[PDB]
């Protein structure tokens, strides 16, 4: 007995044909004779003949990566379902080879190739896990496939494999999970699949790639309000782990941890918690770094943190004022400059209590210098900060002595309503209820038609708000009880006619 009968006639011919094909040093394996021979073996009930085809597929695809037919992929996807580990390894290697091609990435998923891969990842053979998770990451490079991977049920095996002790497996699993964070729907699927606890624990990973992938994935996840809510509810260790990663020896990891904190800084509770967790000393160092990425991330994150009024005192105490002003020297980075000015405006708007150190920082003079030779977005931030500063009666004269009118008057000429309107409002408040009009009088006809020209121009404006600012400014001057100031208005025919007509 012992299988007295031999191999089938058609399978013997397939064996001989395929061996001859593989021995030839030339040959299209994906179309005719070679493909028919391979398919015959992949249909044999002899396991060794199936191993021969799976091994041949892997060798062929490792040397011939082309766009293939369904007739090439069907036998491979059959072999993926084998109970035989050797057949599974080779067949997955072959599919992984073919999946580096872009068109193959689509046809494989369209044919249900994601099914066999998911189950192989749930198995216990580390080599099949590795080839399957690599084929999965390779398929996910195309955005068309990402959503259906996210809903296929594959995030569960990717989450399990992210906990694997083999670093090849773990890097690929976390890399794949990272690839699923580029859309809100995909981030939602990945959160719903339970991957957040795993990503957070792997922030502690000793491999630099793994902790980079998981830091970047959590940062992307934190971009959605609904995910920040669940993070705050189920991940108490998240902020401390990210703060610790701001000490990473890798600039790449330090940058992504800071970007994650910035995203989680959108919610008031995280703006406080990051401060409570000790984030301020790291950020004040990072904004002084020479690494452009480090500065971009840290200034964006302190800007978000400074939105919270209860953080103003601690931010000033941590010494942010002078380093923030030095950031205005990045005259080629609009993003750095706007974030720095916006941070300073937030601090000025929260409290007047540190206004003295605000002035000693050089912030007013530096903003004055940028006001005219900076982009309009930077102009928008500076003019708004000036408008905020001009509200406090306690610092109005200090602002005027600093010659702030030399910046404000030119800005009222701007074609951008934000710049012009912010500067007009600042000017109006500076004329209100001050007890020294020396600087106002000096600026009457001084830089850019001084104040007189500003009133005449805004009295004519088609914008009802701009006209109102001029009329209200004139009333401030008329109420100054300064004989000279009142005469500047009351003895000016051009201002009188602008008011009347």
């Amino acid at each position: 007995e012992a299988s007295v009968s031999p191999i089938a006639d058609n399978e013997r011919e397939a064996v001989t044909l395929l061996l001859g094909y593989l021995e030839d040093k030339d040959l299209d394996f994906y179309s005719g004779g070679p493909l028919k021979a391979l398919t015959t073996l992949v249909y044999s009930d002899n396991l060794n003949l199936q191993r021969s085809a799976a091994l041949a597929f892997a060798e062929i695809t490792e040397k011939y990566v082309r766009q293939v037919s369904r007739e090439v992929l069907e036998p491979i996807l059959i072999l993926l379902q084998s109970q035989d580990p050797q057949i599974q390894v080779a067949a997955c290697a072959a599919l992984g080879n073919l999946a580096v091609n872009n068109e193959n990435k689509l046809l494989i998923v369209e044919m249900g190739g994601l099914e066999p891969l998911i189950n192989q990842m749930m198995g216990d053979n580390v080599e099949v896990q590795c080839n399957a998770v690599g084929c999965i990451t390779n398929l996910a490079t195309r955005d068309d496939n990402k959503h259906k991977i996210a809903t296929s049920g594959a995030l569960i095996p990717l989450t399990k494999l992210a906990k694997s002790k083999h670093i090849r497996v773990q890097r690929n699993a976390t890399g794949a999970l990272l690839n699923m964070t580029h859309s809100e729907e995909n981030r939602k699927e990945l959160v719903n699949a339970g991957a957040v606890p795993v990503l957070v624990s792997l922030l502690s990973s000793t491999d630099p790639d793994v902790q980079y992938y998981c830091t970047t994935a959590l940062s992307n996840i934190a971009v959605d309000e609904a995910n920040r809510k669940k993070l705050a509810q189920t991940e108490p260790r998240l902020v401390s782990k990210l703060v610790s990663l701001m000490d990473s020896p890798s600039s790449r990891v330090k940058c992504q941890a800071t970007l994650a904190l910035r995203n989680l800084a959108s919610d008031t509770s995280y703006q406080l918690e990051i401060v409570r967790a000790g984030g301020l000393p790291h950020l004040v160092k990072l904004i002084q770094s020479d690494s452009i990425p480090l500065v971009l991330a840290s200034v964006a994150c302190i800007r978000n943190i400074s939105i919270h009024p209860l953080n103003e005192g601690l931010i000033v105490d941590a010494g942010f004022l002078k380093p923030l002003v030095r950031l205005l020297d990045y005259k080629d980075s609009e993003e750095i400059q706007c974030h720095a000015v916006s941070t300073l405006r937030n601090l000025a708007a929260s409290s007047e209590k540190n206004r003295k150190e605000f002035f000693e920082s050089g912030a007013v003079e530096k903003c004055k210098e940028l006001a005219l030779d900076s982009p309009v977005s930077v102009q928008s931030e500076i003019s708004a900060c000036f408008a905020i500063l001009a509200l406090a009666d306690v610092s109005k004269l200090d602002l005027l002595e600093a010659n702030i009118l030399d910046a404000l008057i030119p800005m009222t000429f701007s074609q951008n309503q934000e710049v012009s309107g912010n500067a007009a409002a600042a000017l109006a408040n500076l004329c209100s209820r001050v007890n020294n009009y020396t600087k106002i009088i000096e600026a009457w006809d001084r830089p850019n038609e001084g104040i007189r020209g500003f009133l005449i121009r805004f009295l004519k404006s088609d914008y009802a708000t701009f006209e109102h600012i001029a009329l209200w400014t004139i009333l401030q001057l008329l109420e100054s009880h300064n004989d000279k100031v009142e005469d500047l208005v009351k003895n000016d025919d051009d201002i009188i006619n602008g008011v009347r007509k």
Binding site: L19, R51, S52, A56, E59, L178, N263, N304, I307
Partner: protein
Amino acid sequence: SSASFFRPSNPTFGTSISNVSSSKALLSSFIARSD
């Protein structure tokens, strides 16, 4: 509307979207001999 003077600034945020011994021997064991 007086509360508009208390409207907090919009937070800045962002994502990072950057993507990231032979079959011959086995076959030869099945080659048949013939005259």
